[PDB]
């Protein structure tokens, strides 16, 4: 057997007018949406971009996926076209159920999904696709290309729901980061088939992620709010502690399929929906969400970040702190970079980038201020952004350090936080030295520089 299917998510219709801004109806339909975690926008019947592939040119390899619930599985960065893969989907679907694909209804593919993933007798394999874009495979909206495009083409690519351009959007974060971040800005293509399927999880740096599904059958979506994170990962760690050990690298991180009946019982607020071709679904900041496909699809997908987003990314840092997880990006060099460009951002931007920049400032003269207490004294300024990732992350919390760390010279090349002073080696903290990015006196002109853009209106 039995599966009693969550409430439905919210599904929003907006206007020419609402749609017209993506981040101002993002920002409207927040108070709602943000009580279900995940959310279905059907745009105006007029908003239709040209889908258009050659089958047989465009080419992936397939991941392979095993059917349990609770097992284990990689998030991850044999070949197939378009075509063959669409072949052996449809195959699959129609000797699965001894229908003609279109025939089996959704509510059958849902109930169906739960009873194979919990019976262990069931050896039932899956495979899909899951991918940036590339010249083998690219974009489902239309890119800028030196190709002469059609004015159905020309009219979709400045579309603010185009997500190609989501992204570098003036209301977006995200936009700015200069560093290689290739999995965060760019968007993601997934080919679908029947019970493929998507582990629970939240995006990284509790990041929004809006997802379109181009053709195809339905993709089902299960979604719960961010305020209910901690109670789900709760019920993960009780049935499944496999999941929560301490992982080598971001590569090796740990998900599973969970039946939606098992939070429900344990009061973790759930909400579904079957996202049809030609509609999006938008997942909130921490928004836990898992699915699975119906059918043969196409499906692209990206992250954003949103003003509103700036001190849950904060947050988020500092709980992957205590965690020693890694992170994709130091959250406070996406500020300074941003302080550095305070004259061409928006008003709106600057204004909150600048509360999250005297969060930032306040928190770290406090943490200079005991560093120094603990006997470090010889400081030297860093630029940290020089230095590739994997050689400025703390040795004890892995954190990405930007605004300063302590190093000795006993270990060369090693770096910890000033949360983690104690960390680094056994010599006495008067061998230390203090390698910052900016003095105080640096920060506080870069703060004012955002505090006049806003006050301009
Ligand atoms: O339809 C979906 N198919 C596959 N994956 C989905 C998904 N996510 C995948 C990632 C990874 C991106 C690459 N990195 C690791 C995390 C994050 N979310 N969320 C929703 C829907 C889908
Ligand atoms: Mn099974
Ligand atoms: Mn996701
Ligand atoms: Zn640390
Ligand atoms: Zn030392």
Not at 105 to 129: A, C, H, N, Q
Not at 185 to 212: A, T
Request: aromatic letters at 12%.
């Amino acid at each position: 057997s039995m599966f009693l299917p969550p409430p439905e998510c919210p599904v929003f219709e907006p206007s020419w007018e609402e749609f017209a801004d993506p981040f101002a109806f993002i920002h409207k339909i927040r108070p709602i949406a943000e009580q279900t975690g995940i959310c279905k926008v059907r745009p105006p019947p007029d908003w239709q971009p040209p889908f258009a592939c050659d089958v047989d040119k465009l080419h992936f390899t397939p991941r392979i996926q095993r059917l349990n619930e609770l097992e284990a599985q990689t998030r991850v960065k044999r070949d197939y076209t378009l075509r063959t893969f669409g072949e052996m989907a449809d195959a699959f679907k129609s000797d699965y159920f001894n229908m003609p694909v279109h025939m089996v209804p959704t509510e059958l593919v849902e109930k169906e999904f739960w009873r194979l993933v919990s019976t262990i007798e069931e050896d039932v394999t899956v495979e899909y696709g899951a991918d940036i874009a590339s010249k083998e495979f690219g974009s489902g909206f239309p890119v800028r290309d030196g190709i002469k495009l059609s004015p159905e083409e020309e009219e979709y690519l400045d579309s603010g729901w185009n997500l190609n351009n989501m992204p570098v959007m003036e209301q977006s974060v995200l936009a700015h980061i200069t560093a290689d971040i290739c999995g965060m800005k760019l968007p993601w293509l997934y080919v679908g088939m029947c019970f493929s399927s998507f582990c629970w999880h939240i995006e990284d740096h509790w990041s929004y992620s809006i997802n379109y599904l181009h053709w195809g059958e339905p993709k089902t979506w299960y979604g719960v709010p961010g305020y209910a994170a901690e109670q789900l990962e709760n019920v993960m760690k009780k049935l499944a502690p496999e999941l929560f050990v301490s992982q080598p690298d971001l590569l090796h991180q740990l998900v599973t399929i969970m039946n939606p009946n098992t939070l429900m019982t344990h009061e973790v607020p759930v909400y579904r929906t079957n996202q049809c071709a030609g509609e999006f679904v938008i997942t909130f900041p921490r928004a836990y969400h898992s699915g699975f496909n119906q059918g043969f699809n196409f499906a692209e997908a990206v992250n954003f970040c949103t003003v509103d987003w700036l001190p849950l990314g904060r947050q988020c840092v500092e709980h992957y702190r205590l965690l020693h997880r890694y992170c994709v990006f130091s959250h406070d060099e996406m500020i300074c970079k941003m302080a550095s460009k305070a004259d061409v951002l928006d008003v709106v931007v600057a204004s909150t980038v600048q509360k999250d920049m005297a969060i930032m400032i306040e928190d770290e003269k406090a943490l200079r201020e005991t560093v120094r207490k603990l006997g470090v004294i010889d400081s030297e300024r860093m630029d940290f952004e020089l230095l590739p990732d994997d050689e400025r992350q703390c040795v004890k919390c892995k954190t990405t350090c930007f605004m300063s760390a302590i190093s000795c010279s006993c270990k060369p090349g090693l770096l910890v936080c000033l949360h983690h002073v104690k960390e680094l080696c056994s010599c006495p903290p008067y061998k230390y030295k203090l390698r910052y990015r900016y003095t105080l006196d640096d920060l506080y002109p870069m703060m004012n520089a955002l505090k006049l853009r806003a006050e301009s209106y």
